[PDB]
UniProtKB/Swiss-Prot annotation, chain A:
Gene behind this protein: rplM
InterPro entries named in the record: Ribosomal_uL13 (IPR005822), Ribosomal_uL13_bac-type (IPR005823), Ribosomal_uL13_CS (IPR023563), Ribosomal_uL13_sf (IPR036899)
Record SUPFAM superfamilies: Ribosomal protein L13 (SSF52161)
Keyword Translocase: no
UniProt-listed NCBIfam families: rplM_bact (TIGR01066)
Binding partners and assembly: Part of the 50S ribosomal subunit.
Protein role: This protein is one of the early assembly proteins of the 50S ribosomal subunit, although it is not seen to bind rRNA by itself. It is important during the early stages of 50S assembly.
UniProt protein name: Large ribosomal subunit protein uL13
Domain of life: Bacteria
Family, similarity comment: Belongs to the universal ribosomal protein uL13 family.
From Swiss-Prot, chain B:
Organism this protein belongs to: Escherichia coli (strain K12)
Lineage, opening ranks: Bacteria, Pseudomonadati, Pseudomonadota, Gammaproteobacteria, Enterobacterales
Protein name: Large ribosomal subunit protein uL3
Xref: PROSITE patterns: RIBOSOMAL_L3
Membrane spanning residue stretches: none
Residues bearing the modification N5-methylglutamine: Q150
Keywords assigned: Methylation, Ribonucleoprotein, Ribosomal protein, RNA-binding, rRNA-binding
Swiss-Prot record, chain C:
Family per similarity comment: Belongs to the universal ribosomal protein uL6 family.
Protein name: Large ribosomal subunit protein uL6
Known role: This protein binds directly to at least 2 domains of the 23S ribosomal RNA, thus is important in its secondary structure. It is located near the subunit interface in the base of the L7/L12 stalk, and near the tRNA binding site of the peptidyltransferase center. Gentamicin-resistant mutations in this protein affect translation fidelity.
MF (Gene Ontology): large ribosomal subunit rRNA binding; structural constituent of ribosome
Alphabetized Gene3D superfamilies for the sequence: Ribosomal protein L6, alpha-beta domain (3.90.930.12)
Superkingdom, taxonomy of origin: Bacteria
Organism: Escherichia coli (strain K12)
Keyword annotations of the record: Acetylation, Antibiotic resistance, Ribonucleoprotein, Ribosomal protein, RNA-binding, rRNA-binding
One Pfam family from the record: Ribosomal_L6
ATP-binding among keywords: no
Any Gene Ontology CC annotation: cytosolic large ribosomal subunit
InterPro entries noted in UniProt: Ribosomal_uL6-like, Ribosomal_uL6-like_a/b-dom_sf, Ribosomal_uL6_a/b-dom, Ribosomal_uL6_bac-type, Ribosomal_uL6_CS
UniProtKB/Swiss-Prot annotation, chain D:
Gene behind the chain: rpmJ
Family: Belongs to the bacterial ribosomal protein bL36 family.
Gene Ontology molecular function, alphabetical: rRNA binding; structural constituent of ribosome
Purpose of the protein: One of the last ribosomal proteins to be assembled in the 50S subunit, it contacts a number of helices in the 23S rRNA, acting as molecular glue. The simultaneous presence of uL16 and bL36 probably triggers ObgE's GTPase activity and eventual dissociation from the mature 50S ribosomal subunit.
Name of the protein described by the UniProt record: Large ribosomal subunit protein bL36A
Keyword Amino-acid biosynthesis in record: no
An example Gene Ontology biological process: cytoplasmic translation
Keyword hit for Ribosomal protein: yes
Pfam families, alphabetized: Ribosomal_L36
Tree of life domain: Bacteria
InterPro entries: Ribosomal_bL36 (IPR000473), Ribosomal_bL36_sp (IPR035977)
GO cellular component, as recorded: cytoplasm; cytosolic large ribosomal subunit
Subunit structure: Part of the 50S ribosomal subunit.
Key words of the record: Ribonucleoprotein, Ribosomal protein, RNA-binding, rRNA-binding
Length: 142, 209, 176, 38
RNA sequence: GCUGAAAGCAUCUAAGCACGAAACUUGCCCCGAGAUGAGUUCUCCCUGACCCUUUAAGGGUCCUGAAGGAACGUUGAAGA
RNA sequence: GAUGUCGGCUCAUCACAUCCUGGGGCUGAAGUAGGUCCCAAGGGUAUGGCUGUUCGCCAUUUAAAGUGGUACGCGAGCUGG
RNA sequence: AGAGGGAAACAACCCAGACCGCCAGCUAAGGUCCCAAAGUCAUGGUUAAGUGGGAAACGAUGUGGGAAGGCCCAGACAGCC
């Protein structure tokens, strides 16, 4: 008798809303990474995306401890020689606040085609409003 | 301020009565007709879409014809957009003439530079030619070294090499307006502007001083 | 502590209004408002004010001693206000105030004009003197620093904008 | 300003201050005594 | 630097506030929605039957062929 | 059972322990001009005579003629002193 | 001439010596927020430096703990006359 395996055709995914106001960036990202991957469902299988769709509101209101608001640096290389760009946390918030949460979660997801598929189920919004009311997303008080 | 779309007629000179020759570029600026107005509500940004010139009815397609008929203007040879500054209002179908530059002192002219085709590094990047004599073997106009040894082990992105030169969008900034001839649809700017004779030019007031 | 353990007597004519942590004070010289730190609660009483370290924060006593000194100057600003005097030293140096803008001639090739912030008054009893008056002790001290910054007193002849009270220590140019 | 690894009080008026994690010596009397650890 | 305690003083700092460079982020120019996160706006075009089958994002026949595109030709200050 | 070895040419690229330009503190800083240290790598940073020379010396400039890494960068790019 | 697990990767380090099969269980080193299997475990402390997650002489009213000492309501320490 073989171990059960979930099938991509028959797996159901729910929609959730999370308010990132005041939450610690990292301790919020781990909970998102769990549910985006499906580690909270008994039918979890490694090669199938059994996760949920999650909407994150108020991404610009996310909190960090210590001096990380001004000292956490985000590096990236443009591919051109000498093209090493950097941006601290608070200017990432001022310019692209959604990128902060997306980057943190992306690092906690598996790397590869399936990991990139899980990341598509994450909808991050800087403000308080979202236009996914048609999906009837359930409040996830995390 | 918004700009206008004209055509490069050519170059000539204007003699000033005090004995100074001013090299000018003649730009034919016919009436620019507004074909569409975009606003924050429907498009998310404020701009106008203008056309100019004329076009034979047998060369306009039904999608383009319906766009001009929506505005109620005759079909031109193309469409161009201009971002509206705060306070500028325009209505569709309104015609804009060259006298808009009556008090403008300096302009920026945008055009498509003349195409040089596939150009070597000497012409395209001002590389130095190697020796013509003194033993040089088949290496007179070649670019020479293109990198360092194994440590990078690659050629860096953006290296200057031979390739297509010209035939691209080029803007010349802060050109003095010598004369605005409204009744003849002429605009004389001092200096040279990109593009060949007969190419389309976009003339805007100078964004800098 | 020792500063925070001295209650601030609020005299008659001035009133206080505590709203959680944000405090405001009105008086004849104007009104001021200021948010205090979360590490300190201020207890209102009869015409005297008491500051103490709110539990849950280790630096309360250090933070408390500031609020004491903070509103102690707030109550002085709404009754007596604050005054600082600058005296210009040097030939050609002369200041004149029109409206809320100072017109200083500090030997520059261009006139320097400093715009007063809302709430601070100025006047020049003479050409080489300027007196400022206002309610907030921090703001009047800041404005005086900016005017002094235009031409700081040099150590060879004392020329430049200086505080009327402070002493500049000059030195001679070593010959030979 | 003397930028050295060993900052010390050079006279009676020198005061040790720590500003932004940098030990400094400020002297109200001798401007030569101004130091900072670095 | 201002205010200011810890530390009755002092203190640019611990709470708070202000300045401060060709560096940084913008501003200038160019590319840019394969930005697969593939966006937006405007306009245009197509409004027939019928059969089969395991009956579905199914297959097939007849009729129909638009907007537009490509091809071909004359070519270009566009171009291997 | 081969990793072509100096210098030059061409073309570079990075580091900052900065030569110039920018911002400062101190000065045995009057001014001009310097000395020294701190911050700063955006851009810039000679042509000749002699020598295979790197270097150096010399002539004359320049705001300055920076120091290093890159197989003492670069011969399936040139040269061959 | 030695696989397996750990040390990110890593013959020689740590755990441990692979006869074969199992979609059983218990452990070792090492681990238990996510990548990535297991404590967002419990109790009491310390650190504010992202220290942890590289380094010396030496410098410093950083801060925790401990044991004494000098002076002091015959008024000390600081400030002010
Ligand atoms: Mg051509
Ligand atoms: Mg040459
Ligand atoms: Mg040959
Ligand atoms: Mg490589
Ligand atoms: Mg071989
Ligand atoms: Mg080099
Ligand atoms: Mg440096
Ligand atoms: Mg810049
Ligand atoms: Mg070499
Ligand atoms: Mg080679
Ligand atoms: Mg030979
Ligand atoms: Mg391993
Ligand atoms: Mg065995
Ligand atoms: Mg077990
Ligand atoms: Mg796990
Ligand atoms: Mg716990
Ligand atoms: Mg570390």
């Amino acid at each position: 008798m073989k171990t059960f395996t979930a099938k991509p055709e028959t797996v159901k995914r729910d929609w959730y809303v999370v308010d990132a106001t005041g939450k610690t960036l990292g301790r919020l990202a781990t909970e998102l990474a769990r549910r985006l991957r499906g580690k909270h469902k008994a039918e979890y299988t490694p090669h199938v995306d059994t996760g949920d769709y999650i909407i994150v509101l108020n991404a610009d209101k996310v909190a960090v401890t210590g001096n990380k608001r001004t000292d956490k640096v985000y590096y990236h290389h443009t591919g051109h020689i000498g093209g090493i760009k950097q941006a601290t946390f608070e200017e990432m918030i001022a310019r692209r606040p959604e990128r902060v949460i997306e980057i943190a979660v992306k690092g906690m997801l598996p790397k590869g085609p399936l990991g990139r598929a899980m990341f598509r189920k994450l909808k991050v919004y800087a403000g308080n409003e979202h236009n996914h009311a048609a999906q009837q997303p359930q409040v996830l008080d995390i | 301020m918004i700009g206008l779309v004209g055509k490069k007629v050519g170059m000539t000179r204007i003699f000033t009565e005090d004995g100074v020759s001013i090299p000018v570029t003649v730009i034919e600026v016919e009436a620019n007709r507004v074909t569409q107005v975009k606003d924050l509500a429907n498009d998310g940004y404020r701009a106008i879409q203008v056309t100019t010139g004329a076009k034979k009815a047998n060369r306009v397609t039904k999608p383009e014809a319906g766009h001009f008929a929506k505005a109620g203007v005759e079909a031109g040879r193309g469409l161009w957009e201009f971002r509206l500054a705060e306070g500028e209002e325009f209505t569709v179908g309104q015609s804009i003439s060259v006298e808009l530059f009556a008090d403008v002192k300096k302009v920026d002219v945008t055009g498509t530079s003349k195409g040089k085709g596939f150009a070597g590094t000497v012409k395209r990047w001002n590389f130095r030619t190697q020796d013509a004599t003194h033993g040089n073997s088949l290496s007179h106009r070649v670019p020479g070294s293109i990198g360092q040894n194994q440590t990078p082990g690659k050629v860096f992105k953006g290296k200057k090499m031979a390739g297509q030169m010209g035939n691209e969008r080029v803007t010349v900034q802060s050109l003095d307006v010598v004369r605005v001839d409204a009744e003849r649809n002429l605009l004389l700017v001092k200096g040279a502007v990109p593009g060949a004779t007969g190419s389309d030019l976009i003339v805007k007031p100078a964004v800098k001083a | 502590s020792r500063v925070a353990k001295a209650p601030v007597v609020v005299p008659a004519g001035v009133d206080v209004k505590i709203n959680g942590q944000v405090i405001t004070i009105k008086g004849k010289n104007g009104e001021l408002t200021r948010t205090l730190n979360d590490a300190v609660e201020v207890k209102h009483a009869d015409n005297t004010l008491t500051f103490g370290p709110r539990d849950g924060y280790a630096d309360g006593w250090a933070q408390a001693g500031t609020a004491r000194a903070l509103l102690n100057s707030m109550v002085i600003g709404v009754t007596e206000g604050f005054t600082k005097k600058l005296q210009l030293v040097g030939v050609g140096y002369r200041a004149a105030v029109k409206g809320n803008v100072i017109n200083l001639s500090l030997g520059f090739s261009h006139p320097v004009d400093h715009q007063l912030p809302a709430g601070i008054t100025a006047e020049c009893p003479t050409q080489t003197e300027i007196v400022l008056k206002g309610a907030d002790k921090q703001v009047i001290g800041q404005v005086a620093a900016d005017l002094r910054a235009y031409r700081r007193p040099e150590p060879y002849k004392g020329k430049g904008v200086r505080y009327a009270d402070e002493v500049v220590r000059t030195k001679e140019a070593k010959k030979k | 300003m003397k930028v050295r690894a060993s900052v010390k009080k050079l006279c009676r008026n020198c005061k040790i201050v720590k500003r932004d994690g940098v030990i400094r010596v400020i002297c109200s009397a001798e401007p030569k005594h101004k130091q900072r650890q670095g």
